[PDB]
Amino acid sequence: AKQSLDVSSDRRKARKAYFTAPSSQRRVLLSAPLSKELRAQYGIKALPIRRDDEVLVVRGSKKGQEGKISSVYRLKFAVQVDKVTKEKVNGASVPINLHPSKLVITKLHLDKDRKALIQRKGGKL
Amino acid sequence: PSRFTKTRKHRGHVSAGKGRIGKHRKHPGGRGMAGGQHHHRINMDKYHPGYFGKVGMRYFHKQQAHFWKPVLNLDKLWTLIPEDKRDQYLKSASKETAPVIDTLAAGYGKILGKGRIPNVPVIVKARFVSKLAEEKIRAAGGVVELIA
């Protein structure tokens, strides 16, 4: 159970904070776990998901489907992954959004800042 | 609690226990002590005689500390002695070894003689004493010393 007086176990306050989180905090909220291989290589459990990250779906109807992120829709609290879409009646392909908690990250888009973030979290590249 | 009240049982009966003829009206006899000399005079003269009028003389700025004087009776006098030594004092009943009781220390102002202390002598320090209490203590073989 919680100890400190600054953390609130109010369901209402927690839900309000989540649903009115700005995009900067939604970036952390949309963190995703790395694969077993990536976790072994880096030493990182989960990272905030990015735009050019390579992931695999491990939950839902598209379980076991790989792809590169097409966008990180923080407003919609989801990520859109290339090759995870739906074909409509008219033949148009609309992206299928899904939550980063249900992906596994199989290849990170590394920048200077992403590499520094890995070192900060304690990684080894 | 609310579930034990007769309001829970009056649910379904029209008048809620207040009558159909004489209803539960707002203040059908006055508010408070109204009409205590006119139409509640019967209740006053039955249950509270002496309610109306004034008798004594006044006392502007009366302080009860002036009249603080708790009364201790002789039959309760010996409880002011600690019970560890009370038996020893009673058994070794003699002068020149009498227990000393500070009734003011106990918190009393006057000693009254309600009866039958034992024949054990005792020195009792009292702010005020009564005549009978004094005679009873003298007969028991002790003394009352006035204090302040």
């Binding site: 159970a1 176990s9 109010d10 369901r11 209402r12 | -």
Partner: protein, 258 residues
């Protein structure tokens, strides 16, 4: 206090073919002409609005509190009362359950669970773990979302990691012998909490509550005396002392005559 009264509604009186309740004035609103200021009225004030000077805390005599605490402590040592209270103590060798002060000195949750398994409180633990269910009403969105049973109460004398070690394991409570809440000793006013004492706690019980040879350490307190010398009134009734003076009885079921 201003709910239902933030209107300037006035009664229309009789002669207008409507009830005499106060009505909102004005026009062009959809609210104008509507009833106000009544418990029967939509948007009006409730009957007898709830006040904060209602009595919330209720006083209890210190001696009655200590009587209830002593009764709960004594019920913790009745094997049948703990089972009726539902505490999965069938596998326990005997109760009251006393464990060494090394339990007071324990440090980790894993070894706290190991100690519970060793002494037989684990069954109570799985009861609490498998009793977790959603609340059955509007109490979910009042920060009371889940309900679960009450596990063992580990009562200690000194805190050396026992509290933190038992803190995370679900349903186990930890208490000091000095406090020993009735709220934990008889939850729901049901006697017979399953209590695991430490050795130091068990020995401190006599000093903190008194005995026939030591004083209570609560000044002016002594353990209550019973109205009766024993609860075995059946033994008293069937003793020879009473049966000898008792006259012969009938057949325990009167035969129907006529």
């Amino acid at each position: 206090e201003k709910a239902g009264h933030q209107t300037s509604a006035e009664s229309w009186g009789t002669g207008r073919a409507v009830a005499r309740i106060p009505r909102v004035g004005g026009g062009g609103t959809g609210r104008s002409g509507q009833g106000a200021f009544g418990n029967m009225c939509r948007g009006g004030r409730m009957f007898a609005p709830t006040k904060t000077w209602r009595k919330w805390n209720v006083k209890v005599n210190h001696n009655e509190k200590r009587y209830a605490t002593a009764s709960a402590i004594a019920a913790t040592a009745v094997a049948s009362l703990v089972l009726a209270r539902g505490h999965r103590v069938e596998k326990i060798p005997e109760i009251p359950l006393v464990v060494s002060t090394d339990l007071e000195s324990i440090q980790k949750t894993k070894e706290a669970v190991a100690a519970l398994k060793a002494v037989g409180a684990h069954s109570d633990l799985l009861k609490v773990l498998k009793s977790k269910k959603l609340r059955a009403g509007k109490g979910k969105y009042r920060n009371r979302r889940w309900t679960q049973r009450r596990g063992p109460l580990v009562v200690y004398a000194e805190d050396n990691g026992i509290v933190k070690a038992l803190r995370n394991v679900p349903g186990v409570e930890t208490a000091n012998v000095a406090s020993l809440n009735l709220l934990q000793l008889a939850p729901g006013a049901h006697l017979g909490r399953f209590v695991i004492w430490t050795e130091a706690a068990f020995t401190k019980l006599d000093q903190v509550w008194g005995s026939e040879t030591v004083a209570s350490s609560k000044v002016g307190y002594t353990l209550p005396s019973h109205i009766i010398s024993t609860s075995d009134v059946t033994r008293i009734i069937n003793s020879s002392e009473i049966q000898s003076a008792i006259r012969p009885a009938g057949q325990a079921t009167q035969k129907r005559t006529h």
